[PDB]
Amino acid sequence: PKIHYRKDYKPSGFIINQVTLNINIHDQETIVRSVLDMDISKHNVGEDLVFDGVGLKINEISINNKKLVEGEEYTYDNEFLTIFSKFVPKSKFAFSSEVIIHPETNYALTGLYKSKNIIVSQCEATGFRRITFFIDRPDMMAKYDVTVTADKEKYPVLLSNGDKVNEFEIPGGRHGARFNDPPLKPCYLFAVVAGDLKHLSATYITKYTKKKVELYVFSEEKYVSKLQWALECLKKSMAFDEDYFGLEYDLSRLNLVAVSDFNVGAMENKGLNIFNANSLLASKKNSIDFSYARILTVVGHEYFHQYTGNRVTLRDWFQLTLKEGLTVHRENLFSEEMTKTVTTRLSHVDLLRSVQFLEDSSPLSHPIRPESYVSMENFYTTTVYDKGSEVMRMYLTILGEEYYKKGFDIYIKKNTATCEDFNYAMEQAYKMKKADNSANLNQYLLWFSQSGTPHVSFKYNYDAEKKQYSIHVNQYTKPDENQKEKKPLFIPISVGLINPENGKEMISQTTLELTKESDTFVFNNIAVKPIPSLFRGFSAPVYIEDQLTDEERILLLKYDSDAFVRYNSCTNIYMKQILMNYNEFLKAKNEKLESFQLTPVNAQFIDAIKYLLEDPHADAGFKSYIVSLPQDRYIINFVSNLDTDVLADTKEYIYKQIGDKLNDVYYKMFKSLEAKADDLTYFNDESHVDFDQMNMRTLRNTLLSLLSKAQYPNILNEIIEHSKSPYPSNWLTSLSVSAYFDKYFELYDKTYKLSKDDELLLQEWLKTVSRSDRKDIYEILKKLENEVLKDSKNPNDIRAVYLPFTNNLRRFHDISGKGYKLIAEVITKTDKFNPMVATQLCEPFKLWNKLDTKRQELMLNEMNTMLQEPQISNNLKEYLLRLTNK
Numbered sequence: 001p002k003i004h005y006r007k008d009y010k011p012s013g014f015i016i017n018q019v020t021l022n023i024n025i026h027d028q029e030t031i032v033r034s035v036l037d038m039d040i041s042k043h044n045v046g047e048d049l050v051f052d053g054v055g056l057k058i059n060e061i062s063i064n065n066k067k068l069v070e071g072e073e074y075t076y077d078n079e080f081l082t083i084f085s086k087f088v089p090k091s092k093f094a095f096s097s098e099v100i101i102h103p104e105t106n107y108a109l110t111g112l113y114k115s116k117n118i119i120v121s122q123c124e125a126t127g128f129r130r131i132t133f134f135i136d137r138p139d140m141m142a143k144y145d146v147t148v149t150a151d152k153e154k155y156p157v158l159l160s161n162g163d164k165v166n167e168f169e170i171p172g173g174r175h176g177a178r179f180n181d182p183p184l185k186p187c188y189l190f191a192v193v194a195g196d197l198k199h200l201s202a203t204y205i206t207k208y209t210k211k212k213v214e215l216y217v218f219s220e221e222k223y224v225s226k227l228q229w230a231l232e233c234l235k236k237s238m239a240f241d242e243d244y245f246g247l248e249y250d251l252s253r254l255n256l257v258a259v260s261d262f263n264v265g266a267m268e269n270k271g272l273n274i275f276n277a278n279s280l281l282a283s284k285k286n287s288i289d290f291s292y293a294r295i296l297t298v299v300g301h302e303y304f305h306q307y308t309g310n311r312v313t314l315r316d317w318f319q320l321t322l323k324e325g326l327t328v329h330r331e332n333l334f335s336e337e338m339t340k341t342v343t344t345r346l347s348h349v350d351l352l353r354s355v356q357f358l359e360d361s362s363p364l365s366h367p368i369r370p371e372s373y374v375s376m377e378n379f380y381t382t383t384v385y386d387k388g389s390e391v392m393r394m395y396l397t398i399l400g401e402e403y404y405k406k407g408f409d410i411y412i413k414k415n416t417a418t419c420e421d422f423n424y425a426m427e428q429a430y431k432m433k434k435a436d437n438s439a440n441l442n443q444y445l446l447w448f449s450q451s452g453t454p455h456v457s458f459k460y461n462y463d464a465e466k467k468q469y470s471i472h473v474n475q476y477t478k479p480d481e482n483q484k485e486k487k488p489l490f491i492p493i494s495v496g497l498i499n500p501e502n503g504k505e506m507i508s509q510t511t512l513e514l515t516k517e518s519d520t521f522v523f524n525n526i527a528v529k530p531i532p533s534l535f536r537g538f539s540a541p542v543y544i545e546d547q548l549t550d551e552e553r554i555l556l557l558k559y560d561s562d563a564f565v566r567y568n569s570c571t572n573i574y575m576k577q578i579l580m581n582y583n584e585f586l587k588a589k590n591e592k593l594e595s596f597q598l599t600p601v602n603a604q605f606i607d608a609i610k611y612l613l614e615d616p617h618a619d620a621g622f623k624s625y626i627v628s629l630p631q632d633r634y635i636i637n638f639v640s641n642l643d644t645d646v647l648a649d650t651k652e653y654i655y656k657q658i659g660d661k662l663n664d665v666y667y668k669m670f671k672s673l674e675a676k677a678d679d680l681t682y683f684n685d686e687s688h689v690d691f692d693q694m695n696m697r698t699l700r701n702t703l704l705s706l707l708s709k710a711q712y713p714n715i716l717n718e719i720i721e722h723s724k725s726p727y728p729s730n731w732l733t734s735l736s737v738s739a740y741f742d743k744y745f746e747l748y749d750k751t752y753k754l755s756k757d758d759e760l761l762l763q764e765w766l767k768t769v770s771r772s773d774r775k776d777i778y779e780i781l782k783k784l785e786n787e788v789l790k791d792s793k794n795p796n797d798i799r800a801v802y803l804p805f806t807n808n809l810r811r812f813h814d815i816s817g818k819g820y821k822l823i824a825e826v827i828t829k830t831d832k833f834n835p836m837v838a839t840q841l842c843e844p845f846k847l848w849n850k851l852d853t854k855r856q857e858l859m860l861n862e863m864n865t866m867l868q869e870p871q872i873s874n875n876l877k878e879y880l881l882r883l884t885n886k
């Protein structure tokens with residue numbers, strides 16, 4: 001079970017200059033012929049020629065057109081092909097092979113596989129070795145010449161990288177196409193697509209060189225009308241990279257292709273981007289609102305890969321966060337600019353602090369550049385991606401737009417790349433910014449190597465006579481398995497000072513640079529005692545301990561200029577309340593109290609929520625955040641041995657407290673919001689997307705949920721009327737909130753009928769049901785399995801049925817262990833054909849050692865059971881071994 005170590009990087013003792021591919025697709029098999037024009041590198045030392053090759057059936061292999069003999073000249077064990085050096089040339093030579101593979105039965109969705117009636121490849125990170133023999137690593141750059149052949153009736157559209165240079169008919173109702181792609185590339189950027197594809201197209205003229213770029217977006221014929229928004233998003237992405245970064249698209253054509261079966265959101269390949277259908281396809285009638293932001297970010301994401309994917313080659317997979325973190329950052333900038341809503345940034349923060357923080361304090365914790373790996377398929381984490389992006393984002397916060405853009409330019413021009421190369425580039429901008437060639441970003445590198453979430457805490461002092469304000473800051477990171485001693489990080493703290501009398505900014509834009517374990521920042525000429533507005537925009541990926549009173553937090557919530565600090569101040573008020581009530585419920589349970597008291601929710605806090613809700617000029621998206629308690633996975637980072645039942649009771653009490661005061665306000669707003677929220681003026685305009693309007697629907701649907709849970713008088717009338725809405729976000733909401741009423745299975749049937757004839761819509765429906773707050777939710781899942789899901793191997797179907805259920809605090813964590821047992825059964829069943837998705841379904845277990853003693857034991861027993869499965873994949877095993885600290 002080999003472990004790859006970052007310190008042991010060494011260049012290959014070979015070179016592959018040219019790849020010449022012949023991929024012949026047949027009904028029961030695919031024949032791949034490959035000729036590799038190879039050479040010997042300056043690092044060679046007489047070693048064996050070892051190719052990666054997984055699951056390949058050899059017809060023959062050769063060197064210089066002379067067939068090799070097994071046992072004497074080469075061995076193959078279904079993973080590595082070893083050709084003994086004595087039979088390996090010492091100058092330029094040709095290696096060739098013919099193998100048979102079977103996309104029809106490739107249910108792991110890696111390498112070459114069939115999705116519905118489309119043949120498609122997925123080669124990142126190590127899928128190309130599943131197609132043909134290769135030195136399957138990201139620093140092996142080569143030229144590609146690829147011919148594809150297939151039955152013309154079944155596969156009329158043939159696509160691969162580069163230019164289609166030839167099309168030819170073949171005897172037997174077959175045809176062929178040849179694609180030459182001269183620029184060098186890594187093999188994980190190789191792609192091939194074949195199918196009965198329909199497309200929308202457009203021409204984009206670039207800003208500077210005025211070159212015409214053809215844009216194609218493909219799907220199966222049935223869903224071709226759902227492709228327009230994706231096309232628009234692509235236009236948007238090209239324009240943004242132009243305007244913000246000055247980068248034009250390098251090529252003359254861009255293809256986006258949607259497939260039904262895909263392990264992740266999408267995959268960039270040079271000129272040919274392949275997508276999960278749920279991240280490319282949408283219509284107003286058959287998609288929930290969330291799809292539109294999702295497609296925008298994913299299309300944008302794969303697009304921003306393009307310019308840097310050229311010019312910059314990863315030395316090795318340990319530099320993944322440099323590729324992925326930078327792109328997520330660019331994607332985030334794009335999305336914030338395109339949506340123009342503050343909830344876009346908030347939603348990314350909400351994601352980081354729930355999911356990634358949980359990961360970073362779990363046994364799976366790793367830095368964004370890990371020191372080792374067993375399975376590359378487990379390397380693609382929220383830590384590598386989302387903490388990666390926040391570390392990439394901090395460079396911008398530190399430098400500002402002008403110098404950031406200068407540093408980014410340096411990085412591209414100057415540059416195989418490492419995270420250090422990016423740092424060095426940004427460092428040069430840093431020097432120029434501070435006009436001090438002695439200035440450096442050496443400490444910043446700790447963001448790449450140090451695991452765990454730093455804690456930043458504050459103390460304050462105001463001297464009224466001196467007009468002098470001080471902010472005392474402390475940072476620390478808890479030791480973990482990756483570092484016994486944690487060093488202080490370079491932490492940029494974006495701050496303002498709010499005058500509590502009139503809500504005005506008291507100082508200009510200021511970013512404190514914390515570089516020590518602690519420091520004191522002093523401000524003179526501060527006329528009155530301020531309320532500090534800290535980590536504006538969430539300027540560092542840290543736990544913030546603001547040490548503010550709730551009165552101060554309320555004042556920030558009402559009057560601060562920064563959306564994140566307002567939202568965080570709200571969050572912190574909620575957390576103080578949750579921790580207090582949790583401990584009160586816990587003591588009552590422990591001590592078997594017959595009676596006890598609960599601390600009520602702060603009344604001025606409830607007044608502040610009402611104030612903001614009733615402000616017609618305030619933002620609807622932001623409003624939906626303030627009436628929602630913090631995520632369970634955020635809360636859990638703050639509680640030891642969490643009793644999920646006691647947390648459930650805590651949330652219930654707090655929601656009830658606030659509703660008992662504000663429900664009439666909620667109902668009034670739910671009604672007055674209807675006209676603008678559900679405005680149908682542009683319903684049939686496929687390209688008109690209004691993110692403010694979708695936020696209004698989010699607010700209405702949030703309020704509807706609060707009112708339904710509270711059994712507000714006659715709310716069922718509003719629920720039934722809601723189900724008749726043309727918007728899936730609304731009529732799917734009507735389903736889940738109807739859970740608290742007798743009419744649930746009525747709406748269950750109605751919404752099923754609406755959903756069943758669209759594959760993606762059906763999956764949203766499954767999700768809605770899966771997350772329904774039903775006491776009979778286990779019986780309901782069983783129904784979904786037997787009637788809808790069955791033995792589907794579509795990752796979308798499986799994740800749709802089970803993942804939302806796992807977020808059901810009271811039910812998934814049922815003390816019998818029944819929920820853990822159920823998901824472990826699904827994981828083990830899935831792992832037989834798709835280990836990557838099996839690992840995805842482990843996600844609820846990631847917090848196992850944070851729970852109360854009994855639930856820890858239950859989760860651990862189920863993981864140990866999974867670990868005991870004789871046929872467990874290497875993927876699942878490694879992951880569960882790390883998670884259970886074994």
Ligand SMILES: CC(C)(C)OC(=O)N[C@H](C(=O)NO)c1ccc(-n2cccn2)cc1
Binds near residue numbers: 125266267
């Ligand atoms: C959601 C998004 C767009 C941020 O990421 C993806 O949809 N896919 C990423 C990616 O970087 N696409 O360019 C992704 C995630 C995992 C993998 N992967 C995981 C194992 C092997 N490959 C590949 C790509």
Ligand SMILES: [Zn+2]
Binds near residue numbers: 301305323324327
């Ligand atoms: Zn990416």
